[PDB]
């Protein structure tokens, strides 16, 4: 779509918009109101999914602050949708009954797939991405984090599986190191202290 | 928790850790 | 002998620190870790996993 | 280069005093051992059954 | 001193084979006890061995 690949990303953010008395829902509603005002005017950390969400918030905040604060208007619309992405990730930051955020998660992952289609096939379809770094970067970044969210969320994952994988890799390298030592450097029957003297 | 932030001796099992000192010196 | 007896009753901690702790559990692990990291190449296996 | 020759000597002699001379496999090895006659012949001189 | 005053090849080899014979395959006392033992005179040439 050339310069309307940005309109495709805008449609992705509109899909992100598709997805009570506590302060968190008030914060989400305030962020959505800020998205509405910006769009009409410009024209916790202890889980891996939380890491991706925080990252998304940070990146997309820098994105809005690098494009909107700093078919030409699609370059501002696709960056205005980054605040909707940040609102969705701050909603999922407390993922609070999970059934409230389940549909938000489904819309988030579906439009992350749509952005990871549009922006990924954008260079091969004619348009160029390398031109504007501070504009073009954060949408690719949030699409990446969105996809790895649909991988770290869909399968439970958590820090437990990360620690288990790190321990398995270190354990296999440990047995390789012990075999290498006992076979080439010094036999463990020579290195250790023979008891029963 | 109930232990101190101190090392453990490596010469309780092998003397091989003593090979690093002259080689590095 | 009286002064040695008095000083041996006074100290009772520094003697264990200097006879048990100071080399084997304070200085020698530091020396072998620093020596290994100074010796082995800048490799993930040799710098982390093998030590 | 300094440590492998000791392993080479040890393996070279291990082939002649353990691999060929005296093996020792695990698992079911009843029918191969006449040792058990002597082993049960000294059971009252071994530790009280428990 | 601790390294030189350690068991040699003969003592180490007599520590694993000795364990294997009088310590690992001497668990047949429970087998022969559930089937039949007399012990004591199971030495010499009782012919029940």
């Amino acid at each position: 779509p050339w310069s309307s690949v940005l309109l495709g990303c805008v449609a992705a953010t509109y899909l992100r918009a598709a997805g009570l008395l506590c302060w968190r829902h008030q914060r989400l509603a305030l962020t959505a109101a800020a998205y509405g005002m910006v769009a009409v005017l410009t024209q916790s950390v202890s889980t891996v999914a939380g890491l991706l969400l925080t990252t998304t918030i940070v990146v997309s905040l820098y994105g809005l602050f690098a494009a909107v604060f700093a078919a030409a208007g699609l370059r501002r619309l696709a960056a205005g949708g980054l605040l909707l992405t940040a609102a969705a990730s701050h909603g999922l930051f407390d993922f609070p009954n999970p059934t409230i955020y389940s549909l938000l998660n489904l819309g988030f992952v579906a439009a992350a797939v749509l952005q990871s289609y549009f922006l990924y096939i954008a260079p091969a379809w004619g348009v160029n991405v390398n031109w504007d770094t501070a504009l073009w970067g954060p949408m690719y970044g949030t699409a990446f984090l969105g996809l790895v969210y649909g991988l770290v969320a869909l399968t439970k994952f958590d820090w437990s599986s990360v620690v288990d994988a790190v321990l398995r890799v270190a354990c296999w390298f440990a047995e390789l190191t012990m075999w290498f030592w006992d076979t080439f450097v010094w036999k463990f029957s020579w290195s250790e202290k023979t008891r029963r003297a | 928790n109930s232990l101190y932030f101190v090392f453990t001796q490596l010469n309780q099992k092998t003397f091989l850790s003593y090979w690093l000192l002259p080689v590095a010196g | 002998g009286e002064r040695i007896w008095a000083w041996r009753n006074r100290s009772e901690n520094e003697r264990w620190f200097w006879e048990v702790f100071a080399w084997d559990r304070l200085i020698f692990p530091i020396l072998v870790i620093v020596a290994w990291e100074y010796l082995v190449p800048n490799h993930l296996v040799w710098a982390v996993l093998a030590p | 280069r300094y440590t492998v020759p000791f392993m080479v000597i040890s393996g070279l002699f291990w082939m002649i005093h353990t691999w060929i001379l005296d093996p020792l496999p695990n698992k079911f090895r009843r029918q191969e051992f006449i040792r058990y006659r002597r082993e049960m012949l000294h059971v009252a001189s071994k530790l009280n059954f428990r | 001193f601790s390294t030189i005053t350690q068991p040699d090849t003969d003592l180490i080899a007599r520590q694993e084979k000795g364990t294997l014979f009088w310590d690992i395959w001497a668990d047949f006392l429970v087998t022969a006890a559930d089937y039949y033992n007399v012990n004591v005179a199971a030495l010499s040439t009782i012919k029940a061995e």
Side-chain angles (χ1 to χ4, degrees), chain A residues 1-6 8-197, chain B, chain C, chain D, chain E:
Chain A
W2 212 343
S3 62
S4 38
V5 179
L6 301 62
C9 305
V10 152
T13 59
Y14 289 176
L15 210 83
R16 263 99 185 264
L20 309 188
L21 303 180
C22 209
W23 197 46
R24 307 170 142 93
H25 192 91
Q26 192 253 10
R27 176 174 55 206
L28 162 67
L30 194 63
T31 322
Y35 160 74
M37 299 335 262
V38 162
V40 304
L41 277 164
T42 206
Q43 294 285 304
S44 65
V45 296
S46 49
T47 177
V48 189
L51 271 283
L52 318 171
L53 290 169
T54 52
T55 322
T56 289
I57 297 160
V58 158
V59 174
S60 94
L61 272 198
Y62 279 107
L64 181 100
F65 293 0
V68 189
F69 175 66
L74 305 191
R75 292 164 180 84
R76 284 157 330 151
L77 210 62
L82 280 168
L83 193 153
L84 250 193
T85 298
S89 286
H90 221 314
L92 298 173
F93 202 23
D94 325 291
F95 167 77
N97 224 288
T99 174
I100 312 165
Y101 304 123
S102 170
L103 64 150
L104 187 72
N105 219 85
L106 291 174
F108 191 77
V109 68
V113 164
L114 154 75
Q115 264 218 357
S116 157
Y117 205 50
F118 251 104
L119 282 180
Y120 281 20
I121 74 191
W125 223 346
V127 81
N128 198 2
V129 200
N130 325 310
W131 160 266
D132 222 353
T133 181
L135 202 163
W136 280 108
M139 312 157 258
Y140 251 95
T142 182
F144 166 59
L145 308 170
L147 219 75
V148 84
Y149 193 106
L151 261 185
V152 160
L154 247 181
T155 85
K156 304 272 171 323
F157 201 66
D158 202 7
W159 287 116
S160 160
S161 297
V162 176
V163 152
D164 201 357
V166 165
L167 281 175
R168 273 193 277 133
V169 166
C171 157
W172 176 81
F173 272 108
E175 276 102 44
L176 163 73
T177 301
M178 301 275 88
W179 174 86
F180 176 75
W181 220 262
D182 191 66
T183 323
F184 295 102
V185 179
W186 212 244
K187 271 181 193 358
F188 286 152
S189 86
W190 301 346
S191 85
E192 289 164 343
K193 314 308 278 185
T194 295
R195 306 103 171 128
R196 257 218 64 91
Chain B
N1 268 298
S2 74
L3 258 70
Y4 287 143
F5 202 67
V6 292
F7 298 96
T8 321
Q9 42 179 130
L10 321 160
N11 33 67
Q12 90 202 49
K13 246 212 211 158
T14 53
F15 61 92
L16 267 204
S17 38
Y18 270 92
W19 264 108
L20 294 155
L21 304 185
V23 177
Chain C
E2 191 46 40
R3 301 172 164 135
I4 279 163
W5 181 22
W7 152 75
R8 194 149 279 186
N9 283 324
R10 292 319 190 286
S11 79
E12 258 178 1
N13 275 179
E14 302 84 353
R15 83 170 316 207
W16 186 86
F17 170 75
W18 282 115
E19 290 266 347
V20 176
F21 192 79
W23 179 263
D24 307 276
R25 303 186 69 196
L26 182 69
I27 285 168
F28 187 68
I30 293 183
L31 274 186
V32 300
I33 286 164
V34 166
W36 179 273
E37 301 316 310
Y38 175 85
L39 278 183
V40 309
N42 307 53
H43 210 242
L44 172 44
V45 179
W46 292 112
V48 178
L49 307 167
Chain D
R1 275 185 61 84
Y2 275 111
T3 51
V4 161
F6 296 97
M7 322 295 307
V8 173
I9 290 160
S10 71
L12 187 92
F13 280 92
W14 184 89
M15 301 315 258
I16 78 175
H17 64 55
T18 309
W19 193 59
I20 294 171
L21 184 42
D22 174 80
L24 219 43
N26 217 334
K27 302 171 189 182
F28 171 73
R29 293 282 139 150
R30 267 299 317 210
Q31 43 61 42
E32 213 255 336
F33 275 143
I34 207 180
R35 266 75 169 291
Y36 284 10
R37 264 125 191 189
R38 183 46 61 197
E39 153 72 29
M40 306 286 155
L41 262 180
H42 302 317
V43 154
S45 45
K46 314 328 286 195
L47 81 79
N48 207 357
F49 177 55
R50 83 296 180 269
Chain E
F1 192 86
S2 169
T3 316
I4 199 80
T5 60
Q6 243 173 30
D8 37 2
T9 41
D10 183 34
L11 266 304
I12 287 160
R14 279 188 296 146
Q15 264 166 32
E16 327 271 14
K17 311 161 111 43
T19 284
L20 171 90
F21 285 131
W22 312 95
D23 191 19
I24 272 282
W25 287 330
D27 308 340
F28 283 10
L29 268 183
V30 315
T31 283
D34 78 76
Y35 303 73
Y36 189 25
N37 81 30
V38 287
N39 286 110
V40 190
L43 278 40
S44 73
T45 74
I46 179 165
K47 275 180 200 85
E49 319 161 17

